C-alpha cells in the first residue's frame, strides 16, 4: 500500500479519458507531435531547407502546407533543440528543419504509447489483445517510411514531409526514382488495403441486408439491444446468398472476423518490407530480359518500356527543384521530351 | 489497359493530365479505401478480441462457433467497454446494426466519389 | 497500334511479355469512339492490329 | 520409460487446404515474373 | 527472351514444396475421421 500502488490506482481510475501508465508516455508525445505539425503548418517556412513556402502565414492553404524535412546537409542529425546545429536558438531550430525530427520522434514514441495503451486497457478489461496486435501494422509503415527509409539514404531530407501535397510529391518521387508500382511488396500492400475496403463494405452490407425482423418499425437500428444473446442477422441466409451468387461464402463467424484483421494488417506489413528495400535503393526497377530485347530490337515496346520513359521524364523535370542542394543545371537541350510537347 | 503495367501507365498519364492527386474526390477515395482498411481491421480485431471462451489452447478458437448457432459468439459489451475506453465511451458503438451500416457506408461512399 | 501512329505495342505472353507487363492493349486512336466489332474488319488480322479484342472484352 | 505424453494430432481441414493452395498459387503467379526477370 | 534459367526451378519448387506440405496434412486429417 505504498506510493506505487496508490499512483497505479489513480492512473487506472475509470474517467472520461482513461490515463493508465501508458498515458504518461502517450499523452505528452501525441499532444506534442500534433502541436508541432499545427505550429509548423501555420507559421514555419521551408525557405532555407527546401526553397519552399509551407505555412499559412506565407500564403499556403491546407493542401500545400507542410512541416518539411531538414536540409540534406544535416545528414541524419537528431536536430535536438539543444544540440550543435541550432545551439538552443528556437528560431534557427525552426528554420533548420528541427520540427520535423521533433514531430517524427515524438510521433514514434506516441505510437508506442498508443499501442501500450491498447495492451493496458485490454488487460484491465479482460479481453484478448488483438486490437494492439493489429496496430503493429500502422507502426511498421510509419517507422519504415519515416525512419528506416531516410536512414538508408543520405539524410532526413528524403523522408516524406508532413503535408498533403508534400506526401503527393513523395508518391511521385517513388514512381520515377524507385518504380515503386512494379514492386510486388507494394502490390501485396495494395491488395491488402483494397482487400480490406472490400471486406469492410461487403461485410457491413451483408449484415445489414440479412437482418432479422426484431422490431415493428421501418428503422431497423432500434430493434438491436447490446445485451441480447441472439445474433441479429442470419448467418445462414447470408451463407446461402453468397454461395449462390459468388460460389463460396463464409460459414464461420470467427474466421470471418479474423480474416478481417488478417488481410489489411498483412498487406501493410508487406509494403513496409518493400520500403525497407527502397531504403537501400534495392528497387524492383527493371526486367532484364525486356531491357536486353528492347536494346537490340527497336520495334519492341511494352507498357513496361513506356512507363520508364515516364519515370525518366519525372526524374529530369523534377530533380533540380526537388533536390536544390545538388545544383542540378539541366539546359533545355538535355531534357527528355517527346515530339511537340 | 487490361494489364498490371498498363494500369500503372494509365494512372501515371492521368496524373499529368488531370492532377488527380489534387482532386478532392480522389482524396475521399483514398479516405474511403484507407478508412475501410482501418475499420476492417478494427471490427475484425475488436470482434476477435471479445470471443467467448469455448475451446482449449490445443484447438483453433474458430471451432467455438457452429454454423447457424443462435447466440452471438463474442461479447459486444466487453468490446464496447474496451474501445470506448481506448478513445472515450461515445466514440464507440454498442448497436451492432449501426456499426455494420457504418462499415458498409464509409468505403461505399468514398468509392462512389473516386468513381 | 493503341495510339494510331502505326507503333504497335506488344501485350501478350507469346510476344515477349510476362504476367506483370502483359495486357490486352486498348483499341486504336484511329478508331476513337467508333464501334469496331469483328464483322466490320476486312479480316481478323486487321481487327487484331487495331485492338478489336479490347472493345469486345 | 513411459511414452511421451505431449504428442498431439495436427489437423488441416479442406477449406484451409483450398485457402493455402490459393495463396501459394497466387504468390507463385506474382513472383515468377521476378524470378525469370 | 533472355530469362534467368533458375527462374524455372525456383518457380516449380516455390509451388510444389508448400503445396505438398498442405496436401500431406489434409489427407492424414481426413483418414482420422
Amino acid at each position: 500500500r505504498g506510493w506505487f500502488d496508490i499512483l497505479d490506482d489513480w492512473l487506472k481510475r475509470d474517467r472520461f479519458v482513461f490515463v493508465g501508465w501508458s498515458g504518461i508516455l502517450l499523452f505528452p508525445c501525441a499532444y506534442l507531435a500534433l502541436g508541432g505539425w499545427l505550429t509548423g503548418t501555420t507559421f514555419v517556412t521551408s525557405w532555407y531547407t527546401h526553397g519552399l513556402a509551407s505555412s499559412y502565414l506565407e500564403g499556403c492553404n491546407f493542401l500545400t502546407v507542410a512541416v518539411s524535412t531538414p536540409a540534406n546537409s544535416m545528414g541524419h542529425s537528431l536536430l535536438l533543440l539543444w544540440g550543435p546545429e541550432a545551439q538552443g536558438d528556437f528560431t534557427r531550430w525552426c528554420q533548420l528543419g528541427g520540427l520535423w525530427t521533433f514531430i517524427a520522434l515524438h510521433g514514434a514514441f506516441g505510437l508506442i504509447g498508443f499501442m501500450l495503451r491498447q495492451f493496458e486497457i485490454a488487460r484491465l478489461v479482460g479481453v484478448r489483445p488483438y486490437n494492439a496486435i493489429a496496430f503493429s501494422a500502422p507502426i511498421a509503415v510509419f517507422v519504415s517510411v519515416f525512419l528506416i527509409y531516410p536512414l538508408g539514404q543520405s539524410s532526413w531530407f528524403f523522408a516524406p514531409s508532413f503535408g498533403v501535397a508534400a506526401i503527393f510529391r513523395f508518391l511521385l518521387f517513388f514512381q520515377g526514382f524507385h518504380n515503386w508500382t512494379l514492386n510486388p511488396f507494394h502490390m501485396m500492400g495494395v491488395a491488402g488495403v483494397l482487400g480490406g475496403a472490400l471486406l469492410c463494405a461487403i461485410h457491413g452490407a451483408t449484415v445489414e441486408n440479412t437482418l432479422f425482423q426484431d422490431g415493428e418499425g421501418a428503422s431497423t437500428f432500434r430493434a438491436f439491444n447490446p445485451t441480447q444473446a441472439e445474433e441479429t442477422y442470419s448467418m445462414v441466409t447470408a451463407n446461402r446468398f453468397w454461395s449462390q451468387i459468388f460460389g463460396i461464402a463464409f460459414s464461420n463467424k470467427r474466421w470471418l472476423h479474423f480474416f478481417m484483421l488478417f488481410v489489411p494488417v498483412t498487406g501493410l506489413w508487406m509494403s513496409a518490407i518493400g520500403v525497407v528495400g527502397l531504403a537501400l535503393n534495392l528497387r524492383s526497377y527493371d526486367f532484364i530480359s525486356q531491357e536486353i530485347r528492347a536494346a537490340e530490337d527497336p520495334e519492341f515496346e511494352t507498357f513496361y518500356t513506356k512507363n520508364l520513359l515516364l519515370n525518366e521524364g519525372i526524374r529530369a523535370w523534377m530533380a533540380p527543384q526537388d533536390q536544390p542542394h545538388e545544383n542540378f543545371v539541366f539546359p533545355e537541350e538535355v531534357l527528355p521530351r517527346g515530339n511537340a510537347l | 489497359p487490361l494489364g498490371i503495367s498498363g494500369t500503372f501507365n494509365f494512372m501515371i498519364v492521368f496524373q499529368a493530365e488531370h492532377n488527380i492527386l489534387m482532386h478532392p474526390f480522389h482524396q475521399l477515395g483514398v479516405a474511403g479505401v484507407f478508412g475501410g482498411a482501418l475499420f476492417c481491421a478494427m471490427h475484425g480485431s475488436l470482434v476477435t478480441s471479445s470471443l467467448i471462451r469455448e475451446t482449449t489452447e490445443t484447438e483453433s478458437a474458430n471451432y467455438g462457433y457452429k454454423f447457424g448457432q443462435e447466440e452471438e459468439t463474442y461479447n459486444i459489451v466487453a468490446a464496447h467497454g474496451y474501445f470506448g475506453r481506448l478513445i472515450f465511451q461515445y466514440a464507440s458503438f454498442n448497436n451492432s446494426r449501426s456499426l455494420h451500416f457504418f462499415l458498409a457506408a464509409w468505403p461505399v461512399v468514398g468509392v462512389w466519389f473516386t468513381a | 497500334d493503341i495510339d494510331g501512329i502505326r507503333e504497335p505495342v506488344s501485350g501478350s505472353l507469346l510476344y515477349g511479355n510476362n504476367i506483370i507487363t502483359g495486357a490486352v492493349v486498348p483499341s486504336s486512336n484511329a478508331i476513337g469512339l467508333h464501334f469496331y466489332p469483328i464483322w466490320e474488319a476486312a479480316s481478323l488480322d486487321e481487327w487484331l492490329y487495331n485492338g478489336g479484342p479490347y472493345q469486345l472484352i | 520409460m513411459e511414452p511421451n505424453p505431449n504428442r498431439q494430432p495436427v489437423e488441416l481441414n479442406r477449406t484451409s487446404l483450398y485457402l493455402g493452395l490459393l495463396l501459394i498459387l497466387v504468390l507463385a503467379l506474382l513472383f515468377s515474373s521476378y524470378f525469370f526477370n | 527472351m533472355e530469362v534467368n534459367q533458375l527462374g524455372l526451378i525456383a518457380t516449380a519448387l516455390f509451388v510444389l514444396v508448400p503445396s505438398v506440405f498442405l496436401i500431406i496434412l489434409y489427407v492424414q486429417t481426413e483418414s482420422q475421421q
Binding site: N239, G247, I248 | - | - | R14, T15, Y18, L25 | -
Partner: peptide, 30 residues
C-alpha cells in the same frame, strides 16, 4: 518455358476454383 509456367499456374488456379465451389466442405447447421 516462362510462358508455359505462367499459363500452367493460371490453369491450376482455375482448377482449384472448380473444386472449391463444387467440392467444398458443405456447411451444416447446429
Amino acid at each position: 518455358m516462362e510462358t508455359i509456367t505462367y499459363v500452367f499456374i493460371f490453369a491450376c488456379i482455375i482448377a482449384l476454383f472448380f473444386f472449391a465451389i463444387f467440392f467444398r466442405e458443405p456447411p451444416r447447421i447446429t
